[PDB]
Design a protein around this ligand. Sequence first.
Ligand SMILES: *[C@@H]1O[C@H](CO)[C@@H](O[C@@H]2O[C@H](CO)[C@@H](O)[C@H](O)[C@H]2NC(C)=O)[C@H](O[C@@H]2O[C@@H](C)[C@@H](O)[C@@H](O)[C@@H]2O)[C@H]1NC(C)=O
Ligand SMILES: *[C@@H]1O[C@H](CO)[C@@H](O[C@@H]2O[C@H](CO)[C@@H](O)[C@H](O)[C@H]2NC(C)=O)[C@H](O)[C@H]1NC(C)=O
Ligand SMILES: *[C@@H]1O[C@H](CO)[C@@H](O[C@@H]2O[C@H](CO)[C@@H](O)[C@H](O)[C@H]2NC(C)=O)[C@H](O)[C@H]1NC(C)=O
Ligand SMILES: *[C@@H]1O[C@H](CO)[C@@H](O[C@@H]2O[C@H](CO)[C@@H](O)[C@H](O)[C@H]2NC(C)=O)[C@H](O)[C@H]1NC(C)=O
Ligand SMILES: *[C@@H]1O[C@H](CO)[C@@H](O[C@@H]2O[C@H](CO)[C@@H](O)[C@H](O)[C@H]2NC(C)=O)[C@H](O)[C@H]1NC(C)=O
Ligand SMILES: CCCCCCCC/C=C\CCCCCCCCCCCC(=O)O
Ligand SMILES: CCCCCCCC/C=C\CCCCCCCCCCCC(=O)O
Ligand SMILES: CCCCCCCC/C=C\CCCCCCCCCCCC(=O)O
Lengths: 184, 184, 181, 181, 185, 185, 179, 179, 180, 179
Amino acid sequence: SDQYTILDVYKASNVSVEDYKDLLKDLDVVHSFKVLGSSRVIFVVKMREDSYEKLSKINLPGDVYSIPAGDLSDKMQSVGVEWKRWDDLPDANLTLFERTLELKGEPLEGLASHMKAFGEKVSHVMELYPNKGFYLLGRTPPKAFVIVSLPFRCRQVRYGSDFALNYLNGPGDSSTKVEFVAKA
Amino acid sequence: SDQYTILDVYKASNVSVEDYKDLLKDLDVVHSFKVLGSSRVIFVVKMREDSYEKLSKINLPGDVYSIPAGDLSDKMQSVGVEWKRWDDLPDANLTLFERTLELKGEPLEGLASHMKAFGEKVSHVMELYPNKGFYLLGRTPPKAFVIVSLPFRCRQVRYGSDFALNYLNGPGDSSTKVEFVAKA
Amino acid sequence: PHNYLIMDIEPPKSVSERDILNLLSPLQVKHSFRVTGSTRLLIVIRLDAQSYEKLDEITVPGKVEVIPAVNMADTMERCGVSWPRVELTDDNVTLFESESTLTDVTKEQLKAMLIGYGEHMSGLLQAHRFEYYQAAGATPHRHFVFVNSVPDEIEVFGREGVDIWGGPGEFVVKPQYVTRI
Amino acid sequence: PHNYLIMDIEPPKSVSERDILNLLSPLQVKHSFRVTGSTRLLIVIRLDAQSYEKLDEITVPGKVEVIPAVNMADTMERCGVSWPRVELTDDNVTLFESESTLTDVTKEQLKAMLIGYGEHMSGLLQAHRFEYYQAAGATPHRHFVFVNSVPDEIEVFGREGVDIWGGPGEFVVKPQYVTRI
Amino acid sequence: LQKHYIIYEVRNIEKTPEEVKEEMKDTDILYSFKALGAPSYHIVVEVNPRNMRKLEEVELKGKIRMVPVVNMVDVAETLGVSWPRSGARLLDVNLTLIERTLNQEGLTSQESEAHLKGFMEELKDRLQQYNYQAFFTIGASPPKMYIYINIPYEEVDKFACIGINQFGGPAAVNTTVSFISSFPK
Amino acid sequence: LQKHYIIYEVRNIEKTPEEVKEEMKDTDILYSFKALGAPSYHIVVEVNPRNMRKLEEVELKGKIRMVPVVNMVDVAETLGVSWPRSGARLLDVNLTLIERTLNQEGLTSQESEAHLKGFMEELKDRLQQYNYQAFFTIGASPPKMYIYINIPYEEVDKFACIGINQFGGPAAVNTTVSFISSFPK
Amino acid sequence: NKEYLLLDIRDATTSEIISALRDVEIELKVKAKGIARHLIVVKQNDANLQKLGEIDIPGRSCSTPVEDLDNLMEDIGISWPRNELTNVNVTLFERTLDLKDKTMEQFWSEAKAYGQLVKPVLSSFTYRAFKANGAYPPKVYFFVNLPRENLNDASSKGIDIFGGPGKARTTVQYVTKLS
Amino acid sequence: NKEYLLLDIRDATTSEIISALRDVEIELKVKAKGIARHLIVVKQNDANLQKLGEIDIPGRSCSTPVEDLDNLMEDIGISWPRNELTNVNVTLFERTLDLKDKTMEQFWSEAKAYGQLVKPVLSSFTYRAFKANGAYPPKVYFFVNLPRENLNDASSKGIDIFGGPGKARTTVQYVTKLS
Amino acid sequence: QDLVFAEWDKGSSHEHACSALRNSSVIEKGLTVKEVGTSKFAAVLSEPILARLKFHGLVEAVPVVEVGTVMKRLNVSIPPAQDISDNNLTLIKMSPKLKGQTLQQIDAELRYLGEYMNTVLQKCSHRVYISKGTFPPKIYVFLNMPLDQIRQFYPSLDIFGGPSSTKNEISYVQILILRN
Amino acid sequence: QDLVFAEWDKGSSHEHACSALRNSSVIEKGLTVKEVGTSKFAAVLSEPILARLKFHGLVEAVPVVEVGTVMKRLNVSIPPAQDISDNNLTLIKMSPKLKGQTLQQIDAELRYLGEYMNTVLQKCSHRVYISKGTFPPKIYVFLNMPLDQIRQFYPSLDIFGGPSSTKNEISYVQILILR
Ligand SMILES: *[C@@H]1O[C@H](CO)[C@@H](O[C@@H]2O[C@H](CO)[C@@H](O)[C@H](O)[C@H]2NC(C)=O)[C@H](O[C@@H]2O[C@@H](C)[C@@H](O)[C@@H](O)[C@@H]2O)[C@H]1NC(C)=O
Ligand SMILES: *[C@@H]1O[C@H](CO)[C@@H](O[C@@H]2O[C@H](CO)[C@@H](O)[C@H](O)[C@H]2NC(C)=O)[C@H](O)[C@H]1NC(C)=O
Ligand SMILES: *[C@@H]1O[C@H](CO)[C@@H](O[C@@H]2O[C@H](CO)[C@@H](O)[C@H](O)[C@H]2NC(C)=O)[C@H](O)[C@H]1NC(C)=O
Ligand SMILES: *[C@@H]1O[C@H](CO)[C@@H](O[C@@H]2O[C@H](CO)[C@@H](O)[C@H](O)[C@H]2NC(C)=O)[C@H](O)[C@H]1NC(C)=O
Ligand SMILES: *[C@@H]1O[C@H](CO)[C@@H](O[C@@H]2O[C@H](CO)[C@@H](O)[C@H](O)[C@H]2NC(C)=O)[C@H](O)[C@H]1NC(C)=O
Ligand SMILES: CCCCCCCC/C=C\CCCCCCCCCCCC(=O)O
Ligand SMILES: CCCCCCCC/C=C\CCCCCCCCCCCC(=O)O
Ligand SMILES: CCCCCCCC/C=C\CCCCCCCCCCCC(=O)O
């Protein structure tokens, strides 16, 4: 298992995605997504032994959030769900889903059971479309960022946000936000 | 696969367990447990094609409840949980657990996920000790009767009631009643 | 301060107002009432040492609830609220049974509500002969009020202080006409 | 029945009450207030056809909320409640911003509570000069009350009909001292 | 012309089924069912002037609940759904009673109607291949639905859970299944 | 001899970290931390007459949240729980910050104290292996807990979820994890 | 070890109950004052269960496996004084707990907090407490010898630990110990 | 089929937004009256999304994939009229639903009930409705041309279907349709 | 006044004195009904008249008052319509669960319900009784109405909070004594 | 009277006019405090005095009344207010959530809270203000209590329904003007 840092950047004025990418040239930036229609850009940095010292010396302009993260496929494997791991993402039809789970009144075991059932249900479509998933480390409410290449896009976004939502206790206790992203 | 009728009988005055067993002598009574310290007796009748007419011709004295039921191991297998099926009970140390699930605000899929997780957690203990389980057919809130032979029974009663209860959303989303029974 | 026993009796069909004979000679029966229009009985017994000991050989038949109780005026006095000290004597009486059905409440919050209710009712109890009996040790809070039955005053006495306890949905009030027996 | 527009303006530091020149010159500004002690402004504009057409050449800088509104006295009159219709005086004014916070409420229940609040306030509004503006089309219910400022009367006016709306936890009331212009 | 019915839920442990039937005097009875091996009875009576006059002499004993009901096809017609045509006769073979009580907590009338319409649209197709009679409470809150259906026993469980999510899931409904037969035998 | 601290949570996207540090003038800082590559800062100050006098010249800019705190060891002593001795110095290697905010909805004070004691007893044994410093809000509601811990990054996900059920489960606690380093570099 | 079985009998007389249960070893037996209600705690061993399988309890009876609360408290590490119950002012508190949106950890931490809180106060009272073994909602039968002026105090001690008086339903009953 | 992307832009003038979004196909653009707020609904083409990846939108912009509510209603079997929005009394209703303790089936049955209820009402109005695609809590942007006296009438139409005015949060804004 | 709504259940007893409920020399100026086909009986009687009965199985005895009095106390006018008869006689028992509500809120809801029933039940014989001093309040409506229209009263539950804020019992009754 | 509790936050502005909050010629009467180490400022002033300040970033301006007169109106004793000083000076903002509560219930709870704080704050110098006509109500306490005892005010939250039925904010403040 590998650890990551997600840098969620709301770009300052007069600073481009290239400027931010040049500020991070010494780090292992595995993924880089720009939100279409806004100034938000997401950088995924794979952490190594020296990555923390290097990141501590970098100040990115704008509104920056630095969130520790892990690979979602590893988290699904830990709960016993088998998830297809994609080596690369296509450059087209990239859709970002941010899901926060808010299952009120449940112990950790209940949340784990809900997530295991949901993962088993969704693993079949997850094996069909290329995707990269990350989850926030040690974070409650649990939060996941999933970037998936969806053909049949603007109806599959509703279909995929709605898919197996009952296994997560219905549409009332999980929040989903959707963006259209491009490789930065 | 097999259907049963649970006859929960509160014995009428001057009517003994033998009288009730005589009233049901033409039916396939697979189990009959009498609750120690009370007048309650439970008859499990394995239903056949002609069993329903015979049961319709029978009027048992006293407060009698007739509840359709199925094998709990069959239900656990339907949700993908492996449960050891026992041929018979050891005639000693028998303990009856009646559990009713009250998973407030959950869809059917959420309840199925909680039950799958709980069954997976408890299957090892269920394999350790001889037991017979039944669930009420099509009944909501879901209800199960489990008769298990417990060594160390006194503290094992609390241990078994408390075991993996967080997988059922904690001690407040279910009710449990325990009895000491003997083979009738 | 006196301790009390409230016997709410639903006697069997065969037994009928021989219940008095059961409690009459041995026990110090402060009040005996029958719910008007029914056979239900409400007995208030002062629990002195002799009565407490005598209760050993008494068995009231039927569906009977026995509630240990205190005079709630004593509780109010302990909390600093001054209530009129009157003896209910009139043969025409209304009984109000009140219970709190509030699930989210602290001990100090409950004490605040009880003191507020006592202060609120202190003014309206001056022109009345009444007796409050609180179920001692029972949770949630529960009490009985015996008051002079003035018609066109049941609603006023029933609804006074209900909002202090949390509103019409969190407080249960049951008034009943009772005939002294 | 007139239609109104309520502008809650938090202007930038650079802009210094030049919003009046932006607004007052081409629009029919019924009222102009500033929250005392701050730079926030509240403008009540009467929406005639000319003002509505002129609004599309106007941009108010800062953090600005624009709320379509109606005179809630008109709503009360339609619902059968009669309120005094008296213009607001140039004396000092207090503003009450009120919003319903109940989550479990029906449309008919909300209308019943609104009518009850109107009937309750009808008696107490006779000795005051006031203007009610309800946010038209906004759910949950929301309104603003401009009332002549009487000392030691803010608590009475704010704490009035709060129980009809559900109690102190289900109805947000924010009194504010406002200065004209 | 809409038909209205009364369902008498009778719990009597002291009378034989013959005596329970005789307690109805000369009332015309549409259905009389008894739970297998248990002293629980359901008596379904059509409401008309003649039956209402005959019921004046009837005083049922035991634990009785009287429930005015309408046919569920009438509820379907009011909600715009078209349920399959019910069967006139209910045979003893495979006969089952399914009772549903809906909690409806935190809902409005319009919302409850929407949920009921969704449930009925879901159940309409599954009901096609069975011989059944269904009834709904008229005016009672919480509402109650009765289904007397000839269904194979091995399919009862799943059939009793169809459309549960339309009402909010299992915690929002009370579902009871009973094996029944016509009485007296 | 109980020690009291102030934690300043500073969000400032316009000043360099050197300028943010200089904003504190000559007050004595116990810990000054910055999220890796982000403009968030945590400044821990010990409350004493000298520092209180020095803080009169300090006016932090940006989004600032001043939080009075006590050491979690003192909370342990008041709750009768023993706490692994905290390390004096927090190094940049493996340095992490775990923040917890407890909902406590529907509980009394005694109930909350019982839950806190249970959580601390659960965390006691696992906390023994690591260099750490922990703080708890004094008087704030909802309460907040801070842990600055030198823990391997592969273990932080499980360590941050220890004892969650003691507070009612994941939905009853807001937990945030950050990689941090001392500033200015 | 082996815990007990509680028999709650209603429509029977003391003589009838003593005539039955003749060979059954009885840990404790009380009768509610003024009421046809008896509580009989019998030891759970092989002989007692075998005898109970062959007798008819008079009246209407309800059986509940129960565990001595002293043993449970000792199991979770709290040592209660274990003062032998007396025949004076015998009072039964029946308490049911409402655990809603609680985890097992919260239940156990609350139980530990209550045990610790009442451990020093039980040293001045004689008592015998039983908990319905393996039952949810949790139910406790607490027999105490205490003055009748203390009923409100004893019931309210630690009531906030489990969520306050709205979450713990308590009933009080005077009983006579039947020797 | 392909749906839209909505840009909610603040602190930018109309000239800046028009210049920046040059060469981008725009389905509908409006400006809030008296406010530096613009709503731009653009089509989700490959060309549009390619162009949006190379330009900077002035001011503070928030993007949201949106679906035409007419097409969503068509999916679930409800045929809404498609009267083209005009520029006379353009009014934007923004509604957010609260679906606590609801299943997916309840959500869909309520959506169907609302669609059937307001289907005949919309025959006499011009409008354009967009739903935040795949977002939870659900959000709808409803542009209507209606008299200013009907606002309360329009907002409360079928408000009980989703649980009443306490479960649906609605804001109203007058806008100008830019051409 | 001193009206009481009393409900008895004589299912257990196979013999009783409830024939007194049909005895005009015992019941004066009261109303007595029997649930159709059932051993359940109900009455609205003045307290002295209720004192003449000592029936065993009493479900409830709630001091009530005619809605006309309640509406007059709120300055709301409701015509007394006509007198109830034995044809289509239905008893509706309404019990709101006023959870999280205040006294003024329930008063406003009661006034609105009165206004709605004023027009809904203007053309049917009825008798409406409201409990006094009882919380949660109880409403008893003898409606003598067409059975098809019964479902049209459903939306009234919305005034108190919706269908599940209110327990609602419907029964068919037969008049035994109706004296004024 | 016409007292207002006003709170301003000047973090955004590099140069502001809040030095007027330290000017006696502007604050002729009232109290002004600065949160220690930050740029947040608070004051309790008469409305004519509050009209002199025109500051940006006003967090709130709540019409308040001294607790002495509120207690006098309730006929409840209030310990005489000792004058606050600069040492140990703490500001506590208390915002009860009264979900489900009625007006008479919150009034009874406020009376009990006043009676409870009577004994607790008998020795500490303090200044208590309660909001006027604001719902949910707000309480502002200026205290000179030792810091070690701050954790001992926690059970007071129980009067309003427990720790999470109340939002509590603790701050260390410095006196600028006290007249
Ligand atoms: C009563 O339920 C029976 C199952 O419990 C039905 O028998 C089933 O019939 C199926 C179709 O013929 C057959 O595939 C199944 O194997 C069989 N199930 C078994 C044996 O477990 C029975 O229906 C029978 O078949 C139908 C088509 C009719 O011919 C009936 O008269 C048969 O009995 C059910 N009977 C009725 C009357 O509904
Ligand atoms: C049994 O109960 C009686 C009655 O409550 C107790 O006697 C009371 O004791 C208290 C102090 O504990 C005194 O204040 C009362 O004056 C006593 N009342 C009477 C009527 O004497 C008695 O102490 C209790 N005995 C035991 C062993 O608990
Ligand atoms: C646009 O809005 C205006 C202003 O509300 C509407 O004109 C009003 O129409 C209503 C009835 O619909 C009349 O009662 C008012 O008297 C009218 N006001 C004026 C000033 O004429 C107008 O009809 C709306 N137009 C459209 C197309 O919706
Ligand atoms: C009792 O109510 C019934 C059932 O609603 C009434 O019968 C219906 O009356 C309506 C008009 O009110 C007609 O449209 C139906 O055709 C009638 N149905 C039948 C079967 O007759 C009946 O009129 C009412 N009776 C009385 C005496 O009021
Ligand atoms: C200011 O607050 C400090 C911190 O609490 C007070 O000093 C403590 O006082 C308590 C008694 O209240 C002692 O037990 C502690 O030992 C003191 N801590 C020290 C001296 O470091 C101090 O008294 C307060 N000063 C005032 C109120 O003038
Ligand atoms: C520990 C973190 C837990 C958070 C929840 C993680 C759950 C997964 C998170 C987000 C996923 C939601 C959308 C899934 C992506 C879409 C897949 C389906 C796409 C097509 C489906 C279809 O065509 O039916
Ligand atoms: C219709 C569905 C109903 C499902 C409800 C839950 C059913 C689960 C099955 C049984 C419930 C309670 C059983 C627990 C006792 C089983 C034996 C455990 C013994 C434990 C021994 C040990 O702790 O080592
Ligand atoms: C898992 C459950 C754990 C324990 C449940 C709590 C059981 C409490 C039940 C009933 C309460 C009555 C308690 C007995 C008396 C307690 C000790 C005496 C406390 C003070 C007495 C006095 O002040 O007189």
